[PDB]
Amino acid sequence: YKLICYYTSWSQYREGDGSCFPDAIDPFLCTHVIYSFANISNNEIDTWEWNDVTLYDTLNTLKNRNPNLKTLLSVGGWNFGSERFSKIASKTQSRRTFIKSVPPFLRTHGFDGLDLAWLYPGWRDKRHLTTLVKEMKAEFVREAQAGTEQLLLSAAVTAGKIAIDRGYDIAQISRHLDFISLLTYDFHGGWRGTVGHHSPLFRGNSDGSSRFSNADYAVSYMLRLGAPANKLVMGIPTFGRSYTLASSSTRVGAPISGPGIPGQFTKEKGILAYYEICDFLHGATTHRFRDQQVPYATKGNQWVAYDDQESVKNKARYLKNRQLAGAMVWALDLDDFRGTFCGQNLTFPLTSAIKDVLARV
């Protein structure tokens, strides 16, 4: 099985114990580690952070201890303008300059491949995405004639039916990609005025109006569109989403006024790291959506949807039962990476739980 784990460059700036450098990563935990995110300047791949050159180097020394570990560099992301990707991909001269700049950059800094995180192509972009993937893969194939191990190409793909239909020719891009990570953890957010879970495994016979907003539907739909099971990797989150309750109601369908309050270390409205949730749970009431098979917790006017060891092991069993290529984790720096917040002296408890399931029959 593959275990694909993202590390995010901005996690280095978090204070005290929340600070996470590539250094903290156990080299034997994941099969592939992806560094997020690279920039595009002058139509060429480039660094984002001031000290990226150093961090690349720290990440790639993990390979001195585990020579089988693979590392990828992810380009794009949320803070990258979708329109900036659109402009690059739709003009042949810009697209060509970009593609040619990638292999030398990856080689200089020690990466084994490139992850595309264009979030998200519009209906006008779908054709250009296909072209970008095709031509990117062709160039990696050509570069490997120089006797080096061929660069890997992956893509992060949204799990909502409408985003898929609008932006992605799954049947075509599947043939050129080494793996596709399905982002099965954005099924709810502050954008609706109610409480709900962003990563449910199943629909659960109760659910109103969205048979499609669950991991099971997204996986079955990708399989139907022509993504081969052995290229499909199911995304499992290591963070939670928080909401401020608008009333004293805390069950399904409850009102909300907005995001939850920022966490001590992540400092971002609406999300919490798992190591912050471990702390939040002291004094919280815990519940579990039995149909959806995911927990949530509530304390005061704060309502948190999250994943724990049981829910993550369940998702891992599901994906094995479906014979998928593996699991993808967003993100190593949001799991309890020091191992000192969540009880047990177990570093990476969520990621480890996934690995345990994937390593059994």
Ligand SMILES: *[C@@H]1O[C@H](CO)[C@@H](O[C@@H]2O[C@H](CO)[C@@H](O[C@H]3O[C@H](CO[C@@H]4O[C@H](CO)[C@@H](O[C@@H]5O[C@H](CO)[C@@H](O)[C@H](O)[C@@H]5O)[C@H](O)[C@@H]4O)[C@@H](O)[C@H](O[C@H]4O[C@H](CO)[C@@H](O)[C@H](O)[C@@H]4O)[C@@H]3O)[C@H](O)[C@H]2NC(C)=O)[C@H](O)[C@H]1NC(C)=O
């Ligand atoms: C990821 O990469 C991206 C892509 O490169 C990085 O984003 C860019 O990087 C640089 C530097 O930070 C900037 O590049 C040049 O910017 C200037 C361009 O000028 C413009 O400013 C005006 C604001 O008034 C703005 O508005 C319009 O244009 C005209 C203005 O007359 C106006 O009539 C219109 O109505 C518009 O309002 C316009 O959009 C431009 O942004 C240059 O001045 C910069 O410095 C050089 O400039 C001169 C030569 O051109 C020299 O005199 C100077 O000495 C110097 O050499 C610079 O070259 C970009 O702004 C920026 N672009 C994008 C796409 O965002 C990004 O930083 C990176 N991310 C990270 C984390 O690194």
